[PDB]
C-alpha cells in the first residue's frame, strides 16, 4: 500500500461497486439517454473509448480542407494530435506569463481573430482545467467570445467532469468532453461526450447503410468492463462532486504548507483545483549533491510509502491531493519537511 | 453457471491469469515490439481500442478524395462504417449464393477491376472469417489477386487471431487486424493490428510537435485493465491456437448432428471454423404454434442453462462451439433434439 498523488490517477480510483462489479463480469440506454445528459447538463451524451476519441470525433466531424482550430496553449498533447489527425491547422492562444500561466478571454479572442485571417476556423477548444497547472480558465466568458464569433467551442473537461460540478448549458459551449479513467473512477479507456441537440445531426450522423449505427463512433456500443465500471461508480461520482469545495480547500491548505517549506505553487492563486504545479528550487539544488541526484526525490518518497511524481523531477513537478484524507495530506507535507531538512 | 454458445463471446472468456490480474490492478514494450509481431507474423504491430479502430486507422491513412475501397459482402458492419467514416466509396465483392455464401478470389478480382474503372482503389479488405457464416475465404489467393492489381490488402481477422494460426507474412497481405475481446480472452474494447514495415511510416506516422506520439492512435499508449488482460491471457492464447483442429473437428461434429435434426448449417462444408450459421425451418414453424412465439427457443434454451442465441430468433441463427467440452457439446445437441420432440 502506497499514498498515491499522481494527478492522472487520484480521480480514477475504482469504486467498491465498480471493483466488485468488474468481477461478476444493464440499463445502459437509461444511463446514456437520461442520467448522463443530465449529469453533464446537455442534450445528448455518448460514451467513447476515451476523451481524446470524443475530441477527435468532433474535430473530424467539423473539419474542412485547410480549416483551423484554435485551442489554448495549455492544452493536452492529445488535443493537438487529435487536431493533426483531423487534418486541421492549429492556432494556440498564448498564456499569461509566470506564474499565472493563464488563458484570458482576451488573448483567446485575439488569437481567434488573428487566425480568422489565415483561413476558416471551424472549432475552438479550452482545456478546463489544464493538465499542466490545474488552472481553471474563465469558460463562461470564453464560451461568449466564441458564441459571438460563431465558432463552435469544445470544452475539454477531462479534469473536471466527475470532480467538480459542470453544465454545458451553464457554460454556454457546444461540446463538453470528460475522461472516465482520470475523473470518474472507471477503468480501461472510456470517455464521455456531451453536445447541444443541434449537433447530434453532424457529430452523430448515421450510416447510409446501417441507419441505426453512428459513423463517428464506428457503431460501437462500446460494452465491456469499461462501461460497466463507469456505471457502477457513477452514483458515487455524482455524490462525490458535492465535496468539490472541500477538495479545493484541502489543496489550498497543502500549497500553503509547501509555500512555507520553500516549494511554490504556480498558476491560479488561490488555486481552484486539486492538481498543482510546483517550483521547488530547494529540492533541485539538493539533487546536485544528493545520493541519486535527480532520482533522490523519488527514492526518498518511494521509501516513505509515497508514489506519484515523475522520478527524476525536482526543480518542477505536478501532483494531486484529490482523494487524500487529512492525515495523508499531512504525511506528505511532512515527508517534504523531513527530506529537505535531512539533506543539509 | 450457464453454457455459453454466443459467437461474440466463446473466444473472449477471460483467462484465469486475466481474472486474477484484473484483481491486483509491465513489459508492454516487449509485448508490442517483440511478442505480438511474432504472433501475427508481421513487421510492426500495435495495440488499438478495438479491431474497428485499427481498421479505421488504416482506411484514414490511405484515403484520398473520392477514392475507393473494395471489401467482401460478408464484411462486418464496423468494416463498412469505418470506411464511411474515412469518407471512402465502397464497392462490395459479392458472395456466392445459398448454401455457400462464399467470397472467391475470382469475384474479388472482378470487383477490383470494375472498381478501378470508377476511380482510385486505395485499399481492399477480406474478413477472415466473416462473422455471419464463419466462412474462411482463400486469403492466400485473394492476397495474390490484390498484389497483381497493386492494391493494399487489409485482412480483418477479428475471428481468427487467437483462435487459429495466422501469419501476415504467410497470407501475403499488407495489414491484419484482430479483436482482443472476441478472440483473445481479454476484456474491455481492445484490438490488435499488424502490418508490413513499409506501411508503418504511413499509418504509424508521428505527430509534428510530439515526435514521440503516433497520430492515428492519438498518441495513446493504451494502458488499463484492457491491455492488462490481453497480456495476462496471452500465454494461454498463444498455446490455445495449437488446438484449432480439435475445435473444427468438434464444430463439424456438431453441425452433422444438427442436420440429423433438421437444422442445417450453411456456408463452407465441411466447415472450417467454430462459428456456424444455421437454417432451422423446423424451429421457425414450431414458433407459429409454440408457447412463447418467437421467444419460445430463448425460453427452452435459457431454461436448460444455455445462453448465446439472440432471443426471438428461430429460423436462422449463428452460434459457436468454440471452447466447449465434448460433454457440453452433446448437452446442447440433446437440448435441441428435446425441444423439437417436445413440440411435435
Ligand atoms: C488524459 C487527458 C486527456 C485524454 O484522456 P483519455 O480518456 O485517456 O483520452 C485529455 N485532456 C487532458 C487534459 C488529459 O489529461
Ligand atoms: C466484432 C467484429 C469486429 C470489430 O470488433 P472490435 O474489437 O469491437 O472493434 C470486426 N470484424 C468482425 C467480423 C467482428 O465480428
UniProtKB/Swiss-Prot annotation, chains A, B:
Q: Which residues cross the membrane?
A: none
Q: Which cofactor does it need?
A: pyridoxal 5'-phosphate
User: Which GO MF term does the entry hold, naming one?
Assistant: Sep-tRNA:Cys-tRNA synthase activity
- Give the enzyme's main class according to its UniProt record, as a single word: transferase
Q: Which NCBIfam families match?
A: PRK09331.1 (NF006810), SepCysS (TIGR02539)
The role this protein plays is: Converts O-phospho-L-seryl-tRNA(Cys) (Sep-tRNA(Cys)) to L-cysteinyl-tRNA(Cys) (Cys-tRNA(Cys)).
Name the UniProt record assigns to this protein? O-phospho-L-seryl-tRNA:Cys-tRNA synthase 1
Amino acid at each position: 500500500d502506497f499514498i498515491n498523488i499522481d494527478p492522472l490517477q487520484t480521480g480514477g480510483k475504482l469504486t467498491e461497486e465498480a471493483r466488485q462489479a468488474l468481477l461478476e463480469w444493464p440499463p445502459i440506454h437509461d444511463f446514456i439517454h437520461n442520467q448522463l445528459p443530465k449529469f453533464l447538463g446537455c442534450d445528448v451524451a455518448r460514451v467513447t473509448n476515451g476523451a481524446r476519441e470524443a475530441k477527435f470525433a468532433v474535430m473530424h466531424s467539423l473539419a474542412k480542407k485547410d480549416a483551423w482550430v484554435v485551442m489554448d496553449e495549455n492544452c493536452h498533447y492529445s488535443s493537438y494530435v487529435a487536431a493533426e489527425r483531423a487534418g486541421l491547422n492549429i492556432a494556440l492562444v498564448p498564456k499569461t506569463d509566470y506564474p499565472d500561466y493563464a488563458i484570458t478571454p482576451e488573448n483567446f479572442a485575439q488569437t481567434i481573430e488573428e487566425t480568422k485571417k489565415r483561413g476558416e476556423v471551424v472549432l475552438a477548444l479550452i482545456t478546463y482545467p489544464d493538465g499542466n497547472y490545474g488552472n481553471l480558465p474563465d469558460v463562461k466568458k470564453i464560451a461568449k467570445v466564441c458564441s459571438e464569433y460563431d465558432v463552435p467551442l469544445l470544452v475539454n473537461g477531462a479534469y473536471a467532469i466527475g470532480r467538480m460540478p459542470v453544465s454545458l448549458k451553464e457554460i454556454g459551449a457546444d461540446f463538453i468532453v470528460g475522461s472516465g479513467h482520470k475523473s470518474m473512477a472507471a477503468s480501461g479507456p472510456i470517455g464521455v461526450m456531451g453536445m447541444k441537440e443541434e449537433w447530434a445531426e453532424i457529430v452523430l450522423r448515421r450510416s447510409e447503410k446501417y441507419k441505426n449505427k453512428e459513423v463517428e463512433l464506428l457503431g460501437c456500443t462500446a460494452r465491456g468492463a469499461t462501461i460497466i465500471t463507469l456505471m457502477a461508480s457513477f452514483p458515487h461520482v455524482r455524490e462525490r462532486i458535492k465535496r468539490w469545495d472541500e477538495e479545493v480547500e484541502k489543496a489550498r491548505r497543502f500549497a500553503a504548507e509547501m509555500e512555507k517549506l520553500g516549494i511554490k505553487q504556480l498558476g491560479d492563486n488561490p488555486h481552484n483545483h486539486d492538481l498543482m504545479f510546483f517550483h521547488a528550487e530547494v529540492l533541485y539544488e539538493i539533487s546536485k549533491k544528493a545520493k541519486g541526484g535527480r532520482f533522490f526525490l523519488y527514492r526518498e518518497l518511494k521509501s516513505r510509502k509515497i508514489h506519484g511524481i515523475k522520478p527524476g523531477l525536482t526543480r518542477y513537478f505536478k501532483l494531486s491531493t484529490y482523494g487524500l484524507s487529512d492525515e495523508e495530506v499531512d504525511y506528505v507535507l511532512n515527508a517534504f519537511k523531513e527530506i529537505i531538512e535531512k539533506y543539509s
